[PDB]
């Protein structure tokens, strides 16, 4: 599941919590949407939402990675986003 | 160690 953010003064306008040691859902260490900014580009386009897993960004894994490693990751992001969300894989999905 | 975990960072 693919989201096309256009990234911004904002930044993508959302919050994630998640990866190593900052496991959102018990059991599943992947990155989680865990809040979701006003007037963000995931609140516009986005589609998003709170509880998503991020796969990836831009492509680039964030399976398994450590928080800062992975919000660099989408902090490394100019105009233009490729976010690869799915839903809770190793946990309750929804 | 600016973003960091048991906490969520906006993006």
Redesign the interface.
Known sequence: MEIKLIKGPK???????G????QHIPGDNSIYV??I?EGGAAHKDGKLQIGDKLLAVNNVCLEEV???EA??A??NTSDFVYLKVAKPTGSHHH | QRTRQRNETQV
């Not at chain 1, 930044?11 to 919590?17: K, R, T, Y």
């Not at chain 1, 990866?19 to 900052?22: F, L, P, Q």
């Open positions: 930044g993508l306008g959302f919050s994630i919590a990866g190593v040691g900052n865990t809040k900014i450590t928080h800062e919000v660099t989408l902090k």
